[PDB]
Design a protein around this nucleic acid. Structure first.
Lengths: 185, 124, 141, 56
RNA sequence: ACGGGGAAUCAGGGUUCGAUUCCGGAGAGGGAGCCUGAGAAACGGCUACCACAUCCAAGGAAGGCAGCAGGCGCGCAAAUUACCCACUCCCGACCCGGGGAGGUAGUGACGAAAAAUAACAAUACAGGACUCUUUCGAGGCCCUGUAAUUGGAAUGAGUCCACUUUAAAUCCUUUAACGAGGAUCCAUUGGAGGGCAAGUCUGGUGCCAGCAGCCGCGGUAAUUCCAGCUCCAAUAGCGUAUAUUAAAGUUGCUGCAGUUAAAAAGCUCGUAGUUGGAUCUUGGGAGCGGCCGU
């Protein structure tokens, strides 16, 4: 008897067939297109899709004018439009089945940093976030897997404690200044 | 460059405490100490700098917000009446003991051996 | 199934319950005869004592000497031939040494050439046979 | 019979010392090196494909 | 074999596990018998006997970690003789006392999460959409690539004033100045014949040594061994062993098979068991929207 949580689940499932030739091709093609660190980072986003997807199978196979399905289903629809993945007119629950992996990965803040021109490449964008350059609504986001919300897209720029934003120089810009007048006079 | 914005203000007439959640907005400096906190609470609600007991700060990630809990009382005779014994120990008006429970418990069990008034002589 | 009657639950359940014994892997794990005669007694690893080093003759067309070790376990005293794997790893093992003996792979079956050698050596007196082979650690004496 | 020729090969094969090599980039950096090799550089090869480790 | 809540796996059905924090039960070395009390067949109570074991002036006497730490033993298999009533609370005659219940630390790759080990230019130069030229070639409007060529930018690890945190420390957060160019501040563990992603590369060994889950490889050209470069896979992880699930429509209720592959009793009767023919309630009025629907 001890007052702790323990409640933890796995965010990815590994593929059953480990070395399908064409499957390893696609999962590597997703990395360079979105700058991911490992195949783990691909597998979890396919599984977040699969969770969302499998809820639709549980909802489409229910009755119509159903007291569960209309509440249960129209909140999943309300989730997927706010995150910026699903459309505002096509938030009827048929269109979630025609909804692929590449839809989620553009809402990854690793790419939002890249696709507003406040990075140079998608690999550089990870260096900006993981070395805490950026904020979203005046809160420093250190992690590239920030699922940027639809209204939360217009606030993404650099943090207030960043030389790449509106702040003081870092370490390297001061060391050429340390060598500058230190030897001059 | 410090800004206190007090949140969820309540008055307990049954503990004598005006209590608030203190939103300190300090950019580019560390979590500011309780000495620098309470000296702003003195002329935030026209309060005396004795009865203000502030604790439990949590700095938000980035370096622009801590939101800890503090309470301002009616008098210091009420401040001893209704306080944790450690939140009187930060300010220096409750000087605690310095002997721990390993000493006390083995002192207690040696007392448990003697019947009569000879309990006075066993420990130390 | 054969008998499909709506009130035939006890027959359809009980017939399976009987015919499930005719399954090989069921009867290995529901009679305790295999669990009795399992030399480890349902362990993944077992420590024993190297009493003799015996070079086993490889079986069909593969003609080679499989350098194994006869081990006697602590918990049982039941005697086990354990194949020492890598290129020149029998010369890490001596008489009356403690060795952590694991299963071979095929769950109490002879694996590849080696006849009747259902176990292998993993550690050589608290130093792993990989660490000795790669030379990351040494054997104490 | 004879447990006498134990570790005959590994024993007397002339040890080549492992070579000073450029340290391989680890994490997302390898996948950048791995991606830009595979599907941004290369061209349609007439005949059947060469493996990435196809030395000939 | 404590039981269930549950757990793992899982198209659908299932199969397997539940010692383990929540509930109920049992038990305090094994049984048995009791006192006190509202309540106990109490064991941080007692009285025996049995097993075991302690102190001893030999007369006696005291004991019960399946509480918390620790220690031995057994093993494949498991953490500190640490801190504290500050929290949750419980007891007391109680605002005050007490509590290894509980909380905070040490240990910890059982595991789950997030996520460093580079990034950006600079010219060599290797190509590519393309104005030009049949090509060999230049432009370069789009950059695309790699590298012990040259740079100006980064943050974290680490070191540590200072708060913060909390009972008191801790850890995170926050904060200074110090902190990266073979950013040696150096990512491994396994593989490379097939299944199965990935070298008919060299050097050695020559049915030997070894590899190899299975098929198999090794007999002097070894893609399989042992090494060098190499590359493939997963990545702060990864290999092995064992139980178990799916794979298994190889337990088949969904859903198998029985002529010849494993398999219909030699044949018939027969009580349980299972399954059993058709058969008894139809059509009309009426309210109603765009002949039909309610």
């Amino acid at each position: 008897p001890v007052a702790r949580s323990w409640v933890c689940r796995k965010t990815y499932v590994t593929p059953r067939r480990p070395f399908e030739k064409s499957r390893l091709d696609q999962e590597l093609k997703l990395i360079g297109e979105y700058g991911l660190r490992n195949k783990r980072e691909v597998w979890r986003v396919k599984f977040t899709l699969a969770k969302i997807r499998k809820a639709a199978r549980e909802l489409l196979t229910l009755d119509e004018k159903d007291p569960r399905r209309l509440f249960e289903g129209n909140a999943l629809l309300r989730r997927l439009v706010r995150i910026g993945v699903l459309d505002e007119g096509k938030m009827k629950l048929d269109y979630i089945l025609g909804l692929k992996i590449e839809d989620f990965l553009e809402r990854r803040l690793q790419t939002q940093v890249f696709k507003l021109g406040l990075a140079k490449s998608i690999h550089h964008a990870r260096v900006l976030i993981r070395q805490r350059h950026i904020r979203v609504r005046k809160q420093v986001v250190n992690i590239p897997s920030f699922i940027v919300r639809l209204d939360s897209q217009k606030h993404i720029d650099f943090s207030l404690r960043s030389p790449y934003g509106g702040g003081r120089p870092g370490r390297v810009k001061r060391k050429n200044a340390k060598k500058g007048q230190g030897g001059a006079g | 460059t410090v800004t206190i914005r007090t949140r969820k203000f309540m008055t307990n007439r049954l503990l004598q405490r005006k209590q608030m959640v203190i939103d300190v907005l300090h950019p580019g400096k560390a979590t500011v100490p309780k000495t620098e906190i309470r000296e702003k609470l003195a002329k935030m609600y026209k309060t005396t700098p004795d009865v203000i007991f502030v604790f439990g700060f949590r700095t938000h990630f980035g370096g622009g917000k801590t939101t800890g809990f503090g309470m301002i009382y009616d008098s210091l005779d009420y401040a001893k009446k209704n306080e944790p014994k450690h939140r009187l120990a930060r300010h220096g008006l409750y000087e605690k003991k310095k002997t721990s429970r390993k000493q006390r418990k083995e002192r207690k069990n040696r007392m448990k051996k003697v019947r009569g008034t000879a309990k006075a002589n066993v420990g130390a | 199934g054969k008998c499909r009657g709506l009130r035939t639950a006890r027959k359809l359940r009980s017939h399976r319950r009987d015919q499930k014994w005719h399954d090989k892997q069921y009867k290995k794990a529901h009679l305790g005869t295999a669990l009795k005669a399992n030399p480890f007694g349902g362990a993944s690893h077992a420590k024993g004592i190297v009493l003799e080093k015996v070079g086993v003759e490889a079986k069909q067309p593969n003609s080679a000497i499989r350098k194994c070790v006869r081990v006697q376990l602590i918990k049982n005293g039941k005697k086990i031939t354990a194949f020492v794997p890598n290129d020149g790893c029998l010369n890490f093992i001596e008489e009356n040494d403690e060795v952590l003996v694991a299963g071979f792979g095929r769950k109490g079956h002879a694996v590849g050439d080696i006849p009747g050698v259902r176990f292998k050596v993993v550690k050589v007196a608290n130093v792993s046979l990989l660490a000795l082979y790669k030379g990351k650690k040494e054997r104490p004496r | 019979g004879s447990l006498a020729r134990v570790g005959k090969v590994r024993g007397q094969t002339l040890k080549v010392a492992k070579q000073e090599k450029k340290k391989k980039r680890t994490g997302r950096a390898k996948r950048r090196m791995q991606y830009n090799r595979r599907f941004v550089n290369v061209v349609p090869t007439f005949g059947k494909k060469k493996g990435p480790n196809a030395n000939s």
